[PDB]
Symmetry: D2
């Protein structure tokens, strides 16, 4: 009887299920939570609006939430990141999902709206799980009455957290949030090692280019930029790194990279004369990792070496000025999510023109657009933190609190270190790792309990 | 001038040549000399210093002096002094009591010579410490001196732990800056410094090939991360031990197998709990923890014949060297390199195969068997030290009214803005070029164009 | 009549777009097109080709044709064709019989379609082969055709071994060039190609994280060196098996532990000789040997649950997949990815935990589950192929008298000077700049300024 | 015993302690000592040896003696002797003339003391040489001695070139074994030895941070490959120069940018041909070529201020140090470390910023500023030397009639089977376990189960 979904092809469900069964075996933290909490049903009565890339890994997350008692309605947080077999397997399990690979922007917004509304009216949602803040923004702008009954938001990614903190600073945030991104088992696992795995993967799938011996420029050296620069350097690329943050730049130097700017002396005067044309004319690959806007700008695109590959692994596509390219240059599709952008003019191109760039995933997050994003064993950490964060906020029942008590709990918080450690331990056991137990004397010597937590909250890892 | 004690004053010219080179490798510190020369922000400061008397420390000392300070100096380890650096500092008219190869008694005597001048307490008003030994002696033996001291600037993880313990117990008498937890210290010195200097020290002491051999690194904090890289980049097969599952997760993701010396990780102190099969394959063990007895007697008994044993944490009690002194025979190979013969206490066969090689008698190996971290790394740590000395000296805690002392008695870190400023000088030293945000970009991410660029929660 | 057979001719435009990109990545091959355009050195050549029908092979084919040849083409593996490449070649009017996912019967039919044109032997006069299957079929079934063939140019290590065996037995009927042993082939394609494409294929088939997991690479020749790097650079903990102690020495020095699947390295053919403790910790096994049964049934039984098994040597008999077909149940995950359930032959539980994952049914994994080596690497191999075709075609062995044919049967390599010339074009493709020797320098080391730069004994 | 000259005989006990350690790191060489002690295959051999008088050479010498030889020894470089090794050898009753820091006159005198015993030619019958200086002196000055010599075993690439030049000109008087081109020498010592010892020597001489800095390695043969890895593994950004496009292709594929010091690679002797922008960014230049003047005066003028300059090829003429001696002022930092002030010849300002740092006066830096390659690597080279000495001594060329000498007068390598046997012992030293081929597998690949495993064409 179940029809409350919209996916590319329901017949892919059996394939998706085969891949979910494999992914379960690669996600011991998440599966450990399923086993530990199945009896208690800590999410019984939770009704979760979810908006995160509809991948196989998200499928295991969804089914864990459901196994713990929740009901959900789901969409993807990017137009190209859904794996159609994952979406189909979730729909076939009776779970509302509105997601397919290759959505238009209009369809993207419609999919989020289908999670929010059931049978033409607001669903009885009481929790939000978001990656990037688009669902959170729609709820605040269009559905404030729904937020009265929502207990919390659990936010996945750096960009989404920034958006929440902006709302909190402006006094416009209506429900408390957990910053899942800043668990160490998320930020220093997913953001870094996930991109290490999936950046080179996506570039190979899209282009099949040799990377060894070629020149790359990675814009940014935060967690994504660190993992991205390693993805490339481990393949034998000669990688240069750009940064605005001198501490991150110092790390890039010490890690063995030359630190450069696309602009002469680092100063963008807005003119083509401020571009380091000599530097850009030697770059074969540019990757944006910043979470910022226009860090690969029009003048940089004009100066790049002929046939350079351009991609973005930050959350939103506006890292690269693709609007400039759409307005001015001719796009030739090579295959899905791979375009040659011909710099010779807007109306048509010579099939044998040499003056083009190759753009991956139309500038949208390349790892998910041209490959399958991060691997299950990495997403295990992020998604175990999501489950714990959902349990915590659902149990706190913010929406049921009196006004004076809401005022004290309206915050953006992280999970306690003890839980971060518990996720990490399950990850380590998945690798067959064996953690040593402190003796009582050793635990006393460093001032911790034998079971942890092992570090002060100031610790950076 | 006679108010010093060093191994050999005639090494001064060599030390000075090396200081002049080190200046060229320390642009953050040299930038501070230029920036603050006019103000003389340390005029009237009288600084008790206790930190490894290396060439890099020499550049630190001379920066403090160039900013107006007077100092009295000792090393914080018996084997870490570079005798040419000590000589060059003494030859400049600066009181220094330090040499490579001190006894424990001589070590304590050197610290006491900084504290006392012409037989009585110096009129010290600032403390710069690495590991907390000087801080401990002042609190326990010279509490009256602390009434006139404005602050302590503490270099290293172990020393900071000790300060935070004092603050929690209410026994810390003056405010402190935790220099260790600047990012340009902890995530530069503690990690990349050990990356550079661990393999260096092992090569100088043993000249052993590392490629293809098996290592066990105990700990995966900043020092353990850098140490594991030092070995793996040489082609060692490195296994990592940890108690902290987050640090263990990082070791797995970084490409290491995570193992325990004890079966199932359970250290009951019995020989039966040792993973003898694992330890019997290890060619090199390195301790990085800041903890006690992490390479214990039963582990030492089980190690592969001819394994190398060393420690790069602050104190030698990471390894049970007392057990080895009590039970086994020590044959000096050359200074700071001993073969420890597991055949018994009273003599050894010159051709015995059942020995371990211990470096620096278990004391920090990078400084003991080589020269510690390189100048361009120590530039970051020591720029932070100078800024921290300026900050606490200018605050004049000792002279504050009682109500204001109560509010300022704390262990603090430097502001992120200054950490970034030190980083930028370091980056320029490499020829790196940082990009400047446009106004639109700065608005988009919610920061000022000049920084700071990250919230205080950020981990890098 | 369409004198081709491909999966889907509508993929031609896509293939053509990818050919145009690949041309830009293959400067040695495109340089040959330009250099030899005038001469048409392959005018009159009629080349039977059997090599993986990829985009890279497409550029090779079109270079041969641009130099005057006519060709008839098939793939040398059932899973290696890129259907868009085959379509683009068919659409250009070139006979090609190839698709991804051939049966063994279809594979042999495709080779036969190259050999026969319109129901009779084509008037072939040249052979280009990868692995020796076409060479074998010609000798076994069409020996009269070899009377008119001037030579064979053989791509890969396995094919060369087969040719040398024929030469030793007196069964080889035409001379050959060993293309594999150009340095710009063996030490480029076999090593760096596998470095690029092994981890690529494993990711596409499984999307498994590799970092922190345990791999066993069987063999450490050129393919094993590149394969081990592919995995270790992703953070795998890689162990290496070898029978050749020189290759094993290189693996140790490169930072790998060298192990055997068998106790003390001795296989007695029973499960008791398996190192079950070792195999029970392995997450991925990769065979690279060119040998037979190097991942045998007893090893397969002992592997860790849910281990990935794959082969990157030329033929699938490196792994005992016949044992698995006879005894265990195969569940297709997706094309070229099977779970092999060790619970029995007749069915499986969808939730069984005791399975292995086999890629490409044991056929070469880089081509089966991804797209093989990248264009910029295949540029070197395929430049050598073109040069080898030119050389043998020009020599005209088939036109020699019978007594002279007997004396001119050999297996030769290309001269070092040409290997250097290919390498120079590759380097220029990266933007590299080679220095020119001064006359004094060239005299000092005993070479010509233009090369060759090394004696024939040199191993690089 | 007085028939020696060393720096300080009292260092003998230290040398012996280090020899005993080195023995445990040299299982191939010690395996030969044990295997051949009974047979005494070198009984009656009288070996003139000229190779770096290190601890590793000490183990070599004592192995030759243990097998029956008598020797007379000198070093083949003025800065490479370890004085404790020389003392330990002299204290064992073995004639050795070597110390660290010889003058050129003393260097020649030391070689002459090996050649002459009590003022007259020794009754030498074998030569062991590293670089050809002893070989050249014998041919030019002592041709009568060569009549009674059975062979030369030559260690290094430069020496082999010199022998092959003599053979080509018809001036080589006795047969030679090219020890360099065993795989367990060239692809072990030349590459992995330099990987270990280059960064070691730079750190000992300068204590400079390498991570994040720019290096230029001139050459990408075995020494250049190992050198480039030594630097890149420490986090240097390494660029590579080459004249050989095949070696340059390998550098690109290995992840390096390939550059020339000269515009378009044309070294026309002019200042304007220097790529000033490139050289002005280089912090470290290392020469690895075996060629002459590859770091020339115009390059030295253009280098970044405070760049480090060193050579790891056999001879110091890779760098134009004569130009620097004639034009610039040298300030000794410490032994084997000079600042070269580009401000003029007559004195310098102690605070001048415009200088270069030269290590070991341009002589081989790994031996000059550190201890060269490690024992476990030199084990391979020196096991090959022992085998080569045995082979040529047993052949007794000097006793053959003139017509029979003609057939054996050649420069040859050891058989692959022996190369494999050395490698196996090396692998067992790491605890590696080689797999034994089954008879069916050996048949499949066409080899004997015991080896050799590869054709003579194989490049590894
Ligand atoms: N694709 C993925 O799977 C994935 C995974 C995790 C996070 N992300 C996204 O990637 C982005 C980066 O995340 P993060 O965790 O690395 O954030 P981060 O804050 O740790 O790092 C971003 C870095 O970009 C630098 N930067 C900003 N503007 C710059 C400019 N103009 N030039 C150069 N450098 C500049 C900043 O200084 C900072 O160090 C965010 O959008 C985040 O949501 C994507
Ligand atoms: N030698 C040097 O030049 C140098 C440089 C910087 C710091 N240090 C010293 O090195 C030590 C480590 O400093 P750090 O910054 O890395 O500290 P840290 O807190 O970052 O790391 C120490 C690690 O040891 C682990 N650990 C504790 N007990 C353990 C046990 N029994 N087994 C395994 N792991 C265990 C902890 O979990 C932690 O991750 C300190 O003593 C510090 O003062 C030395
Ligand atoms: N997939 C690809 O794209 C690709 C590329 C190049 C070559 N190849 C194929 O890969 C195979 C290997 O080629 P190669 O050039 O490396 O050959 P190689 O001769 O250089 O190396 C093969 C190695 O396998 C080792 N070996 C043999 N039997 C063994 C055993 N039982 N256990 C352990 N090690 C064993 C040998 O000692 C040898 O070192 C061949 O079949 C070749 O045709 C495939
Ligand atoms: N220091 C050590 O311990 C040590 C060890 C082994 C060998 N060596 C010596 O090192 C030298 C190199 O030995 P190798 O075995 O690497 O020789 P090799 O022939 O393998 O390599 C030398 C390389 O230098 C390149 N080259 C020549 N002239 C050049 C120039 N003008 N610019 C750039 N590149 C140029 C050549 O093309 C060649 O690839 C020899 O002198 C050898 O005796 C030293
Ligand atoms: N595989 C994945 N699933 C969900 N979110 C992701 N973010 C990055 N990779 C992802
Ligand atoms: N070189 C050095 N000088 C001072 N303190 C140090 N800590 C580590 N290395 C050091
Ligand atoms: N340690 C060493 N001893 C002898 N010859 C060498 N060549 C390189 N290193 C050496
Ligand atoms: Zn999102």
């Amino acid at each position: 009887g179940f029809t409350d979904y919209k996916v590319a092809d329901i017949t892919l469900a059996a394939w998706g299920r085969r891949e979910l069964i494999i992914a379960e075996s690669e996600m011991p933290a998440l599966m450990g939570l399923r086993r530990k909490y199945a009896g208690q049903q800590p999410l019984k009565g939770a009704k979760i609006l979810g908006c995160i890339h509809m991948t196989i890994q998200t499928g295991v997350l969804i089914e864990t939430l459901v196994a713990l008692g929740a009901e959900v309605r789901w969409s993807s947080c990017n137009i190209f990141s859904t794996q159609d077999q994952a979406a189909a397997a979730i729909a076939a399990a009776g779970i509302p999902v509105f997601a397919w690979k290759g959505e238009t922007e209009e369809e993207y917004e419609w999919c989020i709206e289908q999670t929010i509304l059931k049978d033409g009216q607001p669903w009885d949602a009481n929790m939000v799980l978001d990656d990037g803040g688009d669902l959170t923004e729609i709820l605040h702008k269009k559905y404030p009455q729904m937020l009265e009954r929502i207990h919390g938001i659990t936010e996945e990614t750096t960009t989404g957290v920034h958006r929440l903190l902006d709302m909190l600073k402006n006094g416009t945030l209506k429900v408390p949030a957990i910053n899942v991104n800043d668990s160490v088992t998320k930020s220093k696992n997913d953001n870094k090692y996930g991109c290490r795995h999936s950046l080179n993967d996506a570039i190979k799938r899209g282009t099949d280019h040799l990377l060894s011996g070629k020149q790359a420029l990675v814009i940014g050296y935060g967690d994504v930029g660190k993992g991205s620069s390693q993805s490339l350097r481990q393949e034998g690329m000669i990688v240069k790194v750009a940064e605005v943050d001198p501490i991150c730049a110092m790390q890039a130097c010490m890690d063995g990279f030359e630190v450069v700017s696309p602009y002469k002396n680092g100063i963008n005067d807005g003119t083509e004369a401020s571009i380091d044309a000599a530097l850009l004319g030697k770059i074969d690959l540019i990757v944006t990792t910043t979470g910022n806007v226009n860090v690969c700008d029009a003048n940089m695109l004009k100066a790049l070496k002929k046939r350079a590959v351009v991609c973005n692994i930050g959350h939103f596509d506006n890292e690269i000025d693709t609007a400039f390219m759409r307005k001015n240059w001719a796009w030739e599709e090579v295959k899905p999510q791979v375009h040659k952008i011909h710099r010779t003019g807007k109306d048509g191109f010579d099939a044998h023109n040499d003056d083009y760039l190759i753009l991956l995933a139309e500038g949208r997050l390349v790892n998910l657009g041209n490959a399958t994003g991060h691997p299950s064993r990495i997403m295990d950490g992020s998604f175990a933190n999501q489950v714990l964060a959902q349990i915590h906020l659902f149990e706190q029942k913010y929406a049921d609190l009196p006004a004076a008590e809401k005022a004290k709990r309206l915050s953006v918080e992280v999970l306690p270190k003890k839980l971060d450690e518990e996720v990490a331990l399950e990850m380590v056991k998945g690798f067959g790792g064996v953690v040593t137990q402190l003796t009582p004397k050793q635990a006393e010597y460093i001032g911790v309990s034998v079971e942890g937590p092992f570090k002060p909250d100031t610790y950076r890892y």
